[PDB]
Every structure is written in C-alpha cells, then in structure tokens.
C-alpha cells in the first residue's frame, strides 16, 4: 500500500502512504478573478475517514473553487483529477465570505454551482482568540456552492471557546438570509462540559465547566487522537450534533488523526468521569 506526494509548487515524489492513512488524496484550489484565472495542486496521503469535497466560495468579483478527492488504490494522484470540465450549470446558491467580510456586510451574491449535487451552505468558523498564532486562517464565515462530507442537512459543534458549523440543502437560495452568529441560535436546553488541553491543565477536572449548548447541537461530544505537529495526549469537550459522532467531520476541521468520538444523551454526560 502506497501513494504520491506533491507539493504546491509540486515537487513530484512519493511516500509509503505511511500507515495510519491508506488514502491518497488529491487536493485543489481554483481562483478566478475577472477574465484571468489561477490554480493549485497538493497530492499526499490522508486518513481513511476522508471523502471527496468541493465548496466554491465567492469573495466578491473573485471566486474560489476549492475541492479534494480520494482514492486508496496504490498510486492514484499523479496527473489529473476529475471539452469542458464544468459541463453545464447546475443548482443556484448564494455565496460570500469573511475574506472581505463578504458574508458579514450583506453583499451576498448569486453564484452558480459548477456541478449539480453541489449545494447551498452557510459554513461557520469562529475561534476564541488564539490557539496557536492567533488561530487557523479559515474565514469566520463562508457561504456558497459545494459538497461537504455528510453535508446533506446540517451539522457542527460548539462550546465556550470554539464554534464550528455547517449548513446545506438542495433548495435554490436555501442558505440566504442572515449570518449564523451562534449567540443568535436558540437554547437547546442541554447542559454540558467544555474544555481544551492536555490530560491535565488543558482538560482537567478544574477548567472544565458547565455551559449552555445552543442550537441543534443537543448532543454532548468528546474526542481524542493526535493533533497538530505531533503533540498527542489531546482531547475536546462540547455540545454538538449527530454528525460529529458518526465518522468525524470533527477530524477534518480540528485537524487530528485517527481520533474517536463518543457522545451522551442526557446533559452533563460530558465529564471526563
């Protein structure tokens, strides 16, 4: 079992697809502004949990087609991906981002999908202040055409310090309207436990505290696996939805490897125990 490794520049060399990931993923970003237009390659190996994805976002007069694909077959990613690639124009949607504060200012624009199953989504990312450098560079908000894993319908997670979220649906103009602010959401009634950090002093019995979950995440979630640059012995706590329990859509977002989630019905099932 093996794969290919290509940088962004694309030094095209190989790997053993290591072990914990059997998956060769090809990863691509498409930028378009005015007439001219632009694009990007990363071929590497990625964990089993991963599945194909599109998500094109519109920042105003420039548009960003992201997208990624997986195969596990020894050695897929060299050459191409998968005469006009966007054949036709499929379902309509609204798109804007916090790149320019696009989704924030009411600038929502019409952006046709580049394919038929590609749908409307509000996807949301907040952070507290700083995890690392001031935290990951993903837009505090984004909306437009795509397909995200298990997107059909809705999903996400939350607690005192971090808010992630995902909306989507197959209806025209479904994502439109206001911006999901969290604090905007309703009171799900669930009582839970939030925390970040190591066995102790990140996550310990102390910092932990009771938080009111908001919105559709009435599920109390918790997770573990290795994190960014190999500081392991790491976990997370907070309310969320079914989504984050099956598979992990958590494993994409928080960026961690061969993690495992579990969740509990009645509130406060959250505690390290």
């Amino acid at each position, epitope marked *: 079992l093996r794969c290919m490794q290509c940088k962004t520049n694309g030094d095209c060399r190989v790997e053993e697809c290591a072990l914990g990931q059997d998956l060769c993923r090809t990863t691509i970003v498409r930028l378009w502004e005015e007439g001219e237009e632009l694009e990007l390659v990363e071929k590497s190996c990625t964990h089993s949990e991963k599945t194909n994805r599109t998500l094109s976002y519109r920042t105003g007069l420039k548009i960003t087609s992201l997208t990624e694909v997986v195969c596990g077959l020894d050695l897929c990613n060299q050459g191409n991906s998968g005469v006009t690639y966007s054949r036709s124009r499929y379902l309509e949607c609204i798109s804007c981002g916090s790149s320019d504060m696009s989704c924030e200012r009411g600038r929502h624009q019409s952006l046709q999908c580049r394919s038929p199953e590609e749908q409307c989504l509000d996807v949301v990312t907040h952070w507290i202040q700083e995890g690392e450098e001031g935290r990951p560079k993903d837009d505090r908000h984004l909306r437009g055409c795509g397909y995200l894993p298990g997107c059909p319908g809705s999903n996400g997670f939350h607690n005192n310090d971090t808010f992630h979220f995902l909306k989507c649906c197959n209806t025209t103009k479904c994502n439109e309207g206001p911006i999901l602010e969290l604090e905007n959401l309703p009171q799900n009634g669930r009582q839970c436990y939030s925390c970040k950090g190591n066995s102790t002093h990140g996550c310990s019995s102390e910092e932990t*505290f*009771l938080i009111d979950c908001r919105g559709p995440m009435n599920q109390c979630l918790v997770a573990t696996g290795t994190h960014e640059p190999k500081n392991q012995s790491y976990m997370v706590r907070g309310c969320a939805t079914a989504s984050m329990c099956q598979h992990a859509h958590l494993g994409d977002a928080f960026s961690m490897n061969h993690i495992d989630v579990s969740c509990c019905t009645k509130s406060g*099932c*959250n505690h390290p125990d």
Partner: antibody
Amino acid sequence: EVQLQQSGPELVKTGASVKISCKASGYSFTSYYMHWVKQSHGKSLEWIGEINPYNGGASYNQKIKGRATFTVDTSSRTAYMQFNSLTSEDSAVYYCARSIYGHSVLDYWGQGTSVSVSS
Amino acid sequence: DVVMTQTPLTLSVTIGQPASISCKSSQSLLDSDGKTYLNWLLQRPGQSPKRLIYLVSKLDSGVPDRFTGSGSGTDFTLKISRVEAEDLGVYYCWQGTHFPLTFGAGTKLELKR
C-alpha cells in the same frame, strides 16, 4: 481544591425548624448537582436529595415528606437546606455532595452536619 | 427503592491481608444509558467520608490500585490485597442508578494487630 463546609452544629426544639448551610470553592459551582445524606443512628445511611444551580432542579426522596427545601445563592457559591417540622428519629448527621451533572452519583463531600432535637 | 446489602457486615483484616467485600442490589443497577453508577464510598473515622470508587471499577484520583472494583448484575465485588491502616474506617456501597439513591449497610473494617 474541592471544598465543602457546612454550618457547624445546631440544637432544635422538636416540631420546629432548622437552617444548615453548605459551602464551596473548588470549581465553577454552577457546574454541579448537590446532595444531602442522612447518616442516622450514627450508622444507617439514607439519601435526602439533589439540586442543581444552573437549571434549578430539586429532588426530594419520596419518604422525605417534603419537610425539606433545598435552595441556593449564586453569588455566594452556597447550598442551603431549609428543613421544617422536626423529630426524634430525625436526629442524625447530614452531609452534602456533588454529582455531577445529572446522573446522581457523588464524589466529594463536606465535613457534615450536627443535628439533633429534644426538650 | 432498591436494597443495598453488603457482606461481610463484620470484617477485620490483618495488614498485607486480602479484603473482599461484596454488595447486592434488588434489581439491576444499569441505567438506560448503558453504564452503571454503582459505587464505593468510605468514611475514615474522625474525618469526613470520601469517594473510593464509582462505576463499579473506576478509581478516584488519589486512589491507589490496591483496590479493585468488580461485579455486575445484582451482584458486585470489591478487592484489596495490601490492607493498611488508612483502610481503618467504615465501609459503605451506594448505587446512583435509581432515584432515590441507595446506601449499602456500613461494612466496618479493622486491622488485626
């Protein structure tokens, strides 16, 4: 440090009423369901109840006869027990503890409560 | 109201000696969540009581391995190899798996000298 400190001891004229505190520091108080346990006969052990700072729930054990009132202060980080009409069998040790959340099942306790009544 | 009945009710042990108490519950003690709250809480004399175990195995922070929790169903078992002077005190088992909560008897421990 998990800290539970009750009122000290109290004497009471039978049939009348008593108020016995419970204290804490050592957590976000709002974050745990509180209890009380009757230790009676210097021996036998029996559940009083639960109550729960955030949502404001209150349990009372069936046999209680609701002589009992849990209660709280959020600003004080404090549990109470208002516990009216009193008796001979009553006299015992009364402790409090944390669950928590929900799911009954305690961990840390406080010292206890010295409580008895007579003529 | 389930029954909490512990045995032996009368037990002295000698240091470095085996201590096995056993607790019983009328019905099961397993909540619709598929977990079991049954536990072990000790009162060490002249102090205030403290949680030795919960969840029928899982041990509190400053709790040493010398204790081992067990059992399932209507039956349960507690275990300690190295018995010591700390272990002098009173021994109670309670299940948080029904309201109202239940308390075992009070099995009492000594160290023979």
